[model samples]
Target: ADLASQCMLGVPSYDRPLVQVTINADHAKGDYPDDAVFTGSVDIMQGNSRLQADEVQLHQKRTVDALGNVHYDDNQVILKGPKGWANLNTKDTNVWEGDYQMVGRQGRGKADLMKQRGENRYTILDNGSFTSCLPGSDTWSVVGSEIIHDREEQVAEIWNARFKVGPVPIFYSPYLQLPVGDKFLIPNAKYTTTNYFEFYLPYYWNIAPNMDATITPHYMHRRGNIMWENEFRYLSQAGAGLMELDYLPSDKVYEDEHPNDDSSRRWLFYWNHSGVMDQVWRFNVDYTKVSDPSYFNDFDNKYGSSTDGYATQKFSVGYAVQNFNATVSTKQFQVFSEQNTSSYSAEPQLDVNYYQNDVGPFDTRIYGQAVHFVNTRDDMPEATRVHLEPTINLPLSNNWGSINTEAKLLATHYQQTNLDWYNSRNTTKLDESVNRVMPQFKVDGKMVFERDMEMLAPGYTQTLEPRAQYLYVPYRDQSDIYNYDSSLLQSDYSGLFRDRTYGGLDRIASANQVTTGVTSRIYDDAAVERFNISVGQIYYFTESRTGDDNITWENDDKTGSLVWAGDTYWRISERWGLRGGIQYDTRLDNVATSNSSIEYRRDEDRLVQLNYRYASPEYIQATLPKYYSTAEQYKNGISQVGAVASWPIADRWSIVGAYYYDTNANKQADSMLGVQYSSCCYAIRVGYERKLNGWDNDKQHAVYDNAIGFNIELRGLSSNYGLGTQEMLRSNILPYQNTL
Candidate 1:
């Protein structure tokens, strides 16, 4: 009886005394106001039944005049429609008007007719539409005939739905699935063309929470071909990866000119992975490969040219601890062309160091390095080389002067197979090896002094600095040596006293004498002018043996001569500059080389430059054989002069030209004339150059002799004349092409 009474009251026992009311047979007889009285036969009843509504009638209960908007707060369900009805008592059996909208925290939708399956689930018409927005907002929406939305799982399943972007339809599928979060999968999805004539079907699969893959098959009548392409992307807890594959195999020819050349296919793959272990160590790996070099441009594709058409595989590992560090890496590269044969090489290196300093004695350091190389080539025999060097340096300095000294010991070994052809023509095949060990030491010192001069300018400052160095190496017999790569063992410091070392050697000439040079800098506050100049020379006192045993000298002989070499730079003003340098070999009684240049820059308005260089025939040995031979026909000594100037012509256009000529050779090495048009997003450039024909003499001869014919590059677009040998062999080729 207590349970029945509690159900009738619709309130708990604790809240029964908060408010009290009495009911009677007549409202006027029971309480008070006559204006708000009801006098007809009235009765009040109470029951222990759960609230519910079925086709809720608002005005008349019989015949259900009009189904009103019914809502159940406890059940979390609401429905409103002009002629619609709903049942709130039961968790199921909900029917709304054909065109009605419903919303909830976990689910929102609209349909012609909606039926509730359970507390948090519903089923809509097959052609119904649903959206997360309030009818019309910029949010996600789905249009389908049938849909099953699960609020608990946050997923919706639609049958035969059409996906839309704004007012335009993008794709359609017989079945579609969307996850509450960023997870989704659409199978057999078809997308229509812009003209709505043809379509494409792609299969999409969400393999995992963080990865997805798609396979698409496309057909186009414009090309009269069918192609298949697949793309896959996988993002794991550690790293991410991507792969794409495309293929089209057919004999359909685009033109009759090349009916049999139908083999067109391409493939590419790229991958990158990196990770860190602990807080101090890191590692990374990158690999890429492609099928053909011109595939991308021919197929309207895009790729990174920095790494395109080339394949590389590399791995690196590194570690760091406070002031010490170490790393090891290996790499291999391959090209994609017939002219370039593949080759492989690897290098491993290691280094260590320790440094310290004392107040007045000296600052010193001990360091060493070891390196190994292994390389193989198609045209050259395989070779292996190893090098090791250890050295110590001591530097001492005080307010008065400073001195630096270093000692080094080096060891090298080189081995090769079938390398006799490289060293000599006597034998075409020979297996040889060579090794060398060298120890040398040297010391250098410099002193600086400041003085004031009155004759030149008031408050003038002049600085003078003198420097000297000496190197010694025990003599050894190397006549029977095969030379080969061993000749490269000479040290760079040997050049400091080449005149004393030896007259000449294939390698650097080692010396046992001293080299000295003095430099001075003058600053004048009155004249606001500063100038610098320096000159150096090497003196050889000890006689040295030459490679030719026939030439010999005495140990006390000092007949060796000195060479003068120096340069001077002057800054007349902030906008003007001048520089010049010259080399003289006293032994040769001639200038080895000389060059000079002057430049003037005035803000961004214009710039002018002039350059000149003179080289003796001896220095011309480094020039290419063809150019040297061509120039020799005219004169022995060559002097080249060139000038360039640039100035803005208009807002979006500019013109630039430069010309160079060799006086002795009677030839122009390079010349250029160009105009540029530029804007924020795009730019076009047209230029011409008169290129020398020494290197391409063969090509020019063929074209001039009618041995080969030339064709216009863009003959169909413009009726421009083609290029011939006479035009191409000029000092600059740019102007020749620009004529077309």
Candidate 2:
């Protein structure tokens, strides 16, 4: 009873839960005081249950008669009619040819007969229709015979429901219990080349206010019956996350047609959880797996074949106190295919660090790490490493600029065995142990100057920034021989300022280099950027030295060799923009990499971009196997041009496309074109796509795959199954986007 009372939008909760009434009228006739007949803009104000009528015959205050142009509002609802009579005192709330809407609800409906009775927690209607759209607009609506809402149970029961769209009746349901306590089942229909004809029904079971689960069973004409997917999510004061699983039995259709000895069962499982314990410590865990290498391509039709052929599993735990914290974790990869077969893992890794600012006269910190790298694969190497570092940093800042200085010592000890990756040339006999201790020092300074500018745009503030860094590391030969975790770094403006060009400790470079760069930015009066440019270069004093002996460099031996790089961006207005960059090696007299782009972005929904990229042969050679043939043309690396755009072509219609070509390889890397139509309540997209797959050894040529994609979305409801076209288009074309 108590819960049901809470469900009631009844009289007690009205505007005046306890109030007296008042009455006024233009004229009162009937020749009697108690039996007065009111007419012409008659009104009975009884709290929020007021009535506005052209004529009201108040034979008694509890009942009314002869009301014209009657409008009644009970605060929770509004009922209007040209003529009607209502018994405010009893069960006969008979209204004649009435139309009604809600004040607390965002829906409108009308019925020729709206019958009401005692408590007013329920209502019955005839010729009832409800719509979220404008009253006369027919975008979509639900028309039913009996629309009954028993707020006591917090449910709306509708019968003989017809789902109508724009003057068309498309679907029908016998009965519906809406707002079903976080439990529901929504059905969708679709057809495709692979699925042939499909009807997918998904049921959601909301376990509680903080927990829910969904299960889907998909019926496909081409693949036989498939038991599909499920996901469960839970949230608590301590943690929240989701677990998802999917499975498909052996294809019976394929079994009958094409015999396979391996009765393969396909499945995928992913579970992630992160939560707090003891209020101060935090922990996280992730475990992921798949049945085979081609699971994504074979099972997932919505996302086209995703490139995540590798799965990662990780677990970590950590705690913090004051300025100190530590985390101990382990990471492993489940390599499903050839691409990531050589990936490495760390069976156990430990991190500990402490930092304090304004400690005495300097900021100070200490860091230490220990890792045990392991892999079951023979082609990859395994090792254990321990590292420690302590540093004191001095940061002096003023309004004009800042100068930062740091001094530190780096010590690393690596223990290894089965040195199969020594490449034979670097180490004649595989060593079992190696250690290195190095002292490092660096200082960086920046100064900024600003001046009033009436230069180009309407008004501006032009700022000049000059920065330089000095790095010194007493030479320590790394001939211990390893590139386990390092790769050649791109020599760009940002790269010139890096402390080390290599990624990991296996390939730390000796350095006595100075880097200098200057940048200028043009900001509008509102401090929004309009234009900017930067140029930087690294000048090496020592020969570019390396630990491995299989390679020799003539360009590295030259002192004062500069890797010059520059970048610029311009925003002429909100609608027009352009940005470009180039990296050049002055000593080698070669262009390492370059890119340029122009864009026109009108708003969030409209934009177009043109882009170009180039990379020299020398830079490209570092990432691939050495071509002893020295083919000059292959040395040129890759040059490509592409365009991506999204624009409106007509009313409620838009188009998007992207294209990328590899000029050096003489192939199109990827391309797609899609068209979309969107309305207030629904949206749809159709597109065709092609992507470079891999090499074709049989034909000695490249390979590609072509597929069509589609999606349909209804507004204010559940999500779509497809990845959607806009996301696919923007992610592929403008992965690291600026204006373009």
Candidate 3:
């Protein structure tokens, strides 16, 4: 009757003893309801929770005490001890000398005294040892004089702790805090040629429920430098963001190299934020700044390409609807190298795009952009450009063929300032304000023919697809238009059908041409493609004027484009594949651009890849003038071959290697070789890498730097922190893959 009344009242979950426990025993004595004693198979149960012992004493149904082989379980945790007691009214539980297991969690320990203050709230263990390993397995453990495991915080704090590995004491600390799971506070160490030996110790601070920060102290042995690195992250209902700063008050190497300048301070700051709100508003910000130009070259001791000549910053906000979107953004660049030319900033730019497919009988779209360019560089023009393009398309299609016709008008207005300096250097007179408009017409058609071909391969189908496009645009002089964000688009087999040769709105290439292309493909019965090849060519009705201000297109005067482009891909089997592409200039009777590769891949980490890349002098001069400034300098053009492979040689061991040889320069451009030994609980890796050192304005000669790296990791205990050998191997080997 008392238990029934107790269960009728609601029980708070976070408080201790659940309501209504049934006691079962072979012998019972003392008062029937107010007090009782049970022995021989004494067991007390409440829902799924159970308590058993050789003898139990209940007082007024509000308190229970047990002795001799006592076992207690509350579903979330289990405790076995010689004596235990629980007070139902106060929700206080205590056990003397017991082994406890955090049920459903990777934790088990023995404690001299265990106290459960509240339900899933706190567990205070005195004189205990804890380990994530299974019982009796001493791989690693932490022995603490006082351990407080807070279930609400998912963290464990140890006072006066000793860390051990396989019965060997490795370290000791006055206090140690560890996350409940795999997040461990472990120091990281690495070595490289640039920084020599480096060590990093990090401290994690949990500031709030939605914010965290990590501060690290980094030491470089060769440079005798000490740097402080910090990263802070925050989360909100609207978005998330991160900020990182690395500062070195003084650097011995930098000071020695520059005697006159104050190399007393070197730092880098980077921050980014992005968010979406109201289902239509979006915001983003990304900014980066560094102290010196040579900072990355000296301290970027990793394998990846960190020697970027410019740091870019951008901020934008966007609004979008079902069919319309608008964005206002700004961009700026900081030049870090003399070889890289300074660029203008878009102080404020607005871009709008609208599309509607149900505009009567045709699809219609409009795009508009307005940007103000600002720069302090010498001889660079400042301008405000407003451009708009409106297009309409009519479509007709069927199962076997389709035809589409489109027309578009492009109008742009420019207000130029600070142009006299540019005009004098180019020796040309230009207007301060200009207006240009051009209209384009295009028609595209395609037809597909398919048939069954069981003779070559069982249950196979083949398709022959032929496509043609005709485009017309009248010549418009654009010599006065400033070349901002405009570049030649690389040509491929499908590129012959594109209407424009340039990518940006600054220049619209005049074209009166027709393109023809055909593709053949083989597919298995399941519609899985096995092989494909495409060939195409463009025939110009008039001489193409890519830009009247330049004489680069003089070679196009030969009636037709005089170029044949083709691409092919063949999946020989599940593990073998081949692909290649080439653009041959018929007028020059030579290959202008070509790339080919063959690969054999068994899985993500087991694979072999070989590839070749080439470019003609004419192609290089037109597309990549930054590297090959003049055709005469690279008369033989650029030719290179590379190979990469990762394979297992022994159980739990693997070898990864990559090599790239520049046939034209007769030198190895980049190379890497690594060996890894991985086990169930630990991994050790070491690697060597040699790569192109730095950027040179002139492609006269090549320079290389070699570095060796080492990494040691304890699986599930320490993270793969910093740039270790695993990361170096993955970055250097083009096709390398690994689990994080």
TM-score per prediction, in order, is 0.46, 0.74, 0.83
User: Which window of ten consecutive residues has the lowest lDDT sum in model 3?
Assistant: 3-12
Q: Count the backbone clashes (under 3 Å) in each candidate.
A: 17, 1, 0
For candidate 2, give the lDDT: 0.70
Candidate 2 residues 247-287, lDDT tens each? 77876554665566487466778778898866767778787
For each candidate in turn, give its C-alpha RMSD to the true structure in angstroms: 18.8, 8.1, 7.5
Task: List model 3 lDDT by residue over 335-451, tens digit each.
Answer: 876765658888999999999996888999999999998884876888899999999999999999999999999899989888887788775555688898899999999999999
Ranking by TM-score: 3, 2, 1
Which candidate tops lDDT? Answer: 3
Clashing pairs in 3: none
| Cα displacement (Å) at residue 154, model 2 | 11
Per-residue lDDT for 20-76 in model 1, tens only?
A: 213233223323421223343332222311112223232222121123332222223
